[PDB]
Amino acid sequence: AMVRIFLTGYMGAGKTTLGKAFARKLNVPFIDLDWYIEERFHKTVGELFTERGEAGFRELERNMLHEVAEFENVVISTGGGAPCFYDNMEFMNRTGKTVFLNVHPDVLFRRLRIAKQQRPILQGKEDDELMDFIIQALEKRAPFYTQAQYIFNADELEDRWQIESSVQRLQELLEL
Incomplete structure (x- = not known):
């Protein structure tokens, strides 16, 4: 059968x-x-956000979500905010197998600390400030993320064994 997976x-x-x-x-x-x-706009997402603003960027993201949703035999990753706008989550649920990668804040904290340089929004935040930021961000996003048809614990992706194990568990959960 045709495969179309959305990761959120x-x-x-x-x-x-x-x-x-x-x-x-x-x-x-x-x-x-x-x-x-x-690829479509020949502009980075940061450039689009500055040029179009939040509302404008979210409209274009929605439109591009609708384009990729027509592809067959594909795994599609979405930005962290995508599920919060328009009917994006409901749309993903109707068009493909939608998975929420549920990760405990302790794990997000560790991972984001290590990847701090790659995440400008976190710059300057440490310990309790950083943890509170993540926890609050998840509070705003959770009502959307939790609407995913499938909820998968993605805490363990820290080596080849863990990734392979996770892939197998996800494949089983999605009945693939």
């Missing part, structure tokens, strides 16, 4: 790591929506 969750959850490994396992291509957006 916060930055640091492992959408790229698990997504690419899952796609490889299924032998289908992996598409990161942010990458797709940059």
